[PDB]
Amino acid sequence: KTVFYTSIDIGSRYIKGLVLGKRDQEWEALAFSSVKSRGLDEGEIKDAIAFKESVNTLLKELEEQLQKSLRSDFVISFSSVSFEREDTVIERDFGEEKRSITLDILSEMQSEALEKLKENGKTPLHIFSKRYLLDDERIVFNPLDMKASKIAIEYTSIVVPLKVYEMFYNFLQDTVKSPFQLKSSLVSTAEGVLTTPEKDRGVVVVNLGYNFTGLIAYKNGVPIKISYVPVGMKHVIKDVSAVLDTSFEESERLIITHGNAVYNDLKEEEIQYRGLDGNTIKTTTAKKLSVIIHARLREIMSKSKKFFREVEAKGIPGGVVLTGGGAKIPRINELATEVFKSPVRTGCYANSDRPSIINADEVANDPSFAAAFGNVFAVS
Ligand SMILES: Nc1ncnc2c1ncn2[C@@H]1O[C@H](COP(=O)(O)OP(=O)(O)OP(=O)(O)O)[C@@H](O)[C@H]1O
Ligand SMILES: [Mg+2]
User: Fold this and answer.
1) Which of 57, 205, 261, 344 is deepest in the core (most CB within 10 A)?
2) Within a 13 Å sphere around the CA of 202, how many CA atoms are in the beta-carbon half?
3) CA-CA distance, 72 to 176, in Å (whole number)?
4) How far apart are CA 349 and CA 372, in angstroms?
5) Which one, of 320, 302, 310, 155, lies nearest residue 227 by Cα?
6) Which residues participate in ATP binding (predicted)?
7) Measured at the alpha carbon of residue 121, what is the angle toward residues 324 and 169, in degrees to the nearest 5?
C-alpha cells in the first residue's frame, strides 16, 4: 500500500505544495507545484478571500497531478516573526517501584508537556525531548526499555501566539478538505536541509525569506535559538525599483534572472527593462544591478551576525546553511563566507541526511521547497 504525505508551505510570496508517497519505504514525489501567495502581507492574512483561492489553486494543481483526490492528513507550515523557543520539564516518580520506560509513558509525558506549553497566549507547534534523566542523575540518550524509579525530561518547543494560529487554522479549515497540522516554516526548513551531525555539533540556518530573514540554530539535535532580522528579499526588490524607475515586478524579474551576490568582477554588459508604468524601455548593466543587491545582502547578514555571536554563547562545527529564495542568488555563499567567516553551504532536501526520495530531482534541489519536505519528516 502507498500511504500519502501531503504538505503545504505558506510563504509571503509563494505557496509551495508537495505530495510524497511512502510504499515499503519508497519515498516518491507524486506531485508538486508553487503558486503566487495572496491575501497576506505577512504574519497576518489581510484578505482571506484572496488567500483561500491561492490555496485552492495549489490544491487543484496538486490533485490534478495525482490524478486523484487529496483526503489524507496535511502538514501545513507558515512563516511568522512571532515564533519562539519555550522549554518545560516533566517528571515521574514511581515511588520505590522501578518501572520500565515504555512508549506509552513517553507519550503521556510529551502530552503533559504539550499542555503546559499552551499558556501565555502561545501554543506549541514543535516539541523536542532535549534531555532525559532517570531517577535524578543518569543522563541517557534514549530512556526506552530502561528501568527507572523516577524520570525527568526537559523539552524544547517552538510556540506561536494562538492569535496567529487561529487566523491560519480557520481559513485553512475551510479550504483543505481534510485535517491538518500547522508548523513553523523556519523549523521545517531546518528539518529538511540539515544533517544529524550538523543538528548535533552546531549549525545555524539562515532563511533568506521575503519580508524578513529567519534565524534558527541547532545544537545537540534540537533548536537552541530562533529569531530573525526585519530585512528580507522584499527590501532588495524595493531597492532595485527605487534605484531604477522600474516597477516592482520588473525589479524582481531582474533580480531573479540577472542578480549576483558579487558585483566586483561582473561585465558592464547592457540589460534592458521596462520603465515605471510604461513601455519606456530603460537600460542598466549587470554590475550596477548587483551593486544595488550587494548592499542589501551585506546588511541582512551583517545584521544577523549578532545572532551568530549570541548563540556562540552555547556553534559553527556546522557553520551556516542558507535557505529560501535568497539562497538562490548566484555566489551568495561566497558573500556569506566573508561576512560570517565560517563555512557556508546551500540548504535543500538533497544535501540532507533525509531519505533519497525517488522521482523528485528539481524540487529536492530547490531551496524554496526545503520546508515542504521538512513538514513531512518533522513528523514520521
Ligand atoms: N532563483 C532566484 N534567484 C534569486 N532570487 C530569487 C530566486 N527565486 C526567488 N528569489 C527571491 O526570493 C523571494 C521569495 O523568497 P522565498 O521563496 O523565501 O519566499 P516565501 O517562502 O514566499 O516567503 P517567506 O519567507 O515568508 O516564507 C522573491 O521575492 C525573489 O526576490
Ligand atoms: Mg520560505
Assistant:
1) 205
2) 12
3) 10
4) 9
5) 310
6) 12-14, 16, 79, 210, 252, 325
7) 55
Tell me the one-letter amino acid at 305: K
Q: Break the chain into its structural domains and give their ranges.
A: 2-79+168-193+348-374, 80-166, 194-231+298-347, 232-296
Look up residue 171 and give its three cell numbers. Answer: 481559513
Query: For the purposes of burial, counting CB atoms within 10 Å of the CB of 279, is it exposed (0-12), middle (13-18) or buried (19 or more)?
Result: exposed
Q: What is the helix, strand, coil percentage profile of the chain, to 5?
A: 35, 30, 35
- State the architecture of 232-296 in CATH terms: Alpha-Beta Complex (3.90)
Q: At residue 287, what are phi and psi to the nearest 5 degrees?
A: -70, -45
* Of 255, 257, 329, 369, best ligand 1 pocket probe by most atoms within 8 Å of the beta carbon: 255
Pocket lining for ligand 1, CB < 6 angstroms: 11-14, 37, 42, 79, 185, 209-211, 233, 237, 252, 255-256, 259, 324-326, 328-329, 368
Side chain identity, residue 75: V
Q: Name the method of structure determination.
A: X-ray
Q: Which residues pair with 157 in a beta bridge?
A: 86, 127
Nearest-angstrom CA–CA distance, 160 and 124: 7
Rounded CA-CA distance 201/196 in Å is 8
Architecture of domain 80-166: 2-Layer Sandwich (3.30)
**Cβ atoms within 10 Å of 61's Cβ, excluding its own:** 16
- Entry resolution in angstroms? 2.6
